[PDB]
Homo-oligomer: A and B are copies of this chain.
Amino acid sequence: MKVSLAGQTVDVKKILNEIPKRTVTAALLEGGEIVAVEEADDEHAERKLVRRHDVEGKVVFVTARPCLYCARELAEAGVAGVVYLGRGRGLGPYYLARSGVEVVEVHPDEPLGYDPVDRLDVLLTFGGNPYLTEEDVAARVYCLLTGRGFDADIAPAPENLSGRVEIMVTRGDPDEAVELLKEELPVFRIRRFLISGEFDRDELRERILEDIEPRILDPFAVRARIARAGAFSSSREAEVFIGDVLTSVGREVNLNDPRTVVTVDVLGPRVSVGVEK
């Protein structure tokens, strides 16, 4: 759906699926295209946007309802329009409508299209609860991690994949985090990954030998999940490959009762692997 306001037309799905959504985010639009983006940290997204860029005459897209202080700054800075998602306690829209600024609250009937994290430190998996959403689970997760002093990029339903929430820990220890999460999200599958990136086959071999093999207790078994085919095309293709690297080094495999399981996740070009005992 598209909104026409203040001299430009903004297409909602495009902008959504094009800005980061790790936290509340503000994007500055000109001619309908994004010329700036800021993400909330201690500072609100809108405030960073206004002081770090020139917003006058333009349209701002925000991923939540702007708080009052921000609406004031946006209006005073001379923004002409604001398009926002209908989330949050913020009252700034009502102040904006009374300040000459065109404002619209959109509710897409489709998933937002979150991005998969660049480094899948922790993967969370859950099923069969029709009323629960990835965003609910990501909400809890976000609350716990930040609550405990952690910094993380959290991605619910990346690529609109259901049952999934992905975590990348940028500050603090990933294994402290899974411990936390295991404790609170009892019925969810939590998985730690020791390496995760877009690797050549050669690069992936070197990485497995470096960070995965030494952690192995024989016998092992490789279990691969293909969330999106790319670097590998089937579970067995990746199992055989990773298995061979190790088995030729030379570790022992036993698929029936291994002491260590080597986990692999594949999302398109992204390969992640960890070990569980």
Residues of A within 8 A of B (CB): 1-6, 9, 21-24, 40, 63-64, 81, 86-89, 91, 93-94, 96-111, 126-140, 142-144, 146-147, 156-157, 160-162, 184-188
B6, B110, B162, B188: the one within 8 Å of A136 (CB): B188
Which chain B positions have C-beta within 8 A of A87?
A: 130, 132-133, 136
On whether the beta carbons of B100 and A127 are closer than 8 Å, the reply is no
What is the predominant secondary structure among interface residues of chain A facing chain B? loop
Cβ distance A215 to chain B, nearest Cβ, rounded Å: 25
Q: What's the Cα separation between A106 and B104 when bound, in Å?
A: 5
Sample (8) of A-B pairs whose CB atoms are under 8 Å apart: A2-B3, A2-B5, A3-B4, A63-B130, A105-B108, A129-B138, A129-B186, A140-B187
B3, B5, B108, B187: the one within 8 Å of A94 (CB): B108
On whether the beta carbons of B4 and A104 are closer than 8 Å, the reply is no
Q: What's the Cα separation between A9 and B2 when bound, in Å?
A: 9
Q: What's the Cα separation between A188 and B21 when bound, in Å?
A: 22
B86, B130, B143: the one within 8 Å of A142 (CB): B130
On whether the beta carbons of A109 and B99 are closer than 8 Å, the reply is yes
B21, B94, B132, B157: the one within 8 Å of A109 (CB): B94
Cβ-closest chain B residue relative to A80: B109
List the number of copies, as a whole number. 2
On whether the beta carbons of A1 and B104 are closer than 8 Å, the reply is yes
Cβ distance A127 to chain B, nearest Cβ, rounded Å: 4
**Which of A104, A110, A126, A162 has most B Cβ within 10 Å?**
A104
Decide: A24 near B130, CB < 8 A? Known: A2-B4, A3-B2, A157-B89: yes
Q: What's the Cα separation between A101 and B105 when bound, in Å?
A: 15
On whether the beta carbons of A144 and B131 are closer than 8 Å, the reply is yes
Decide: A186 near B187, CB < 8 A? Known: A1-B5, A102-B109, A132-B139: yes
Q: What's the Cα separation between A179 and B117 when bound, in Å?
A: 35
On whether the beta carbons of B129 and A88 are closer than 8 Å, the reply is no
Cβ-closest chain B residue relative to A187: B140
Cβ-closest chain B residue relative to A189: B140
B24, B108, B186, B188: the one within 8 Å of A93 (CB): B108
Q: What's the Cα separation between A14 and B108 when bound, in Å?
A: 24
Cβ distance A74 to chain B, nearest Cβ, rounded Å: 13
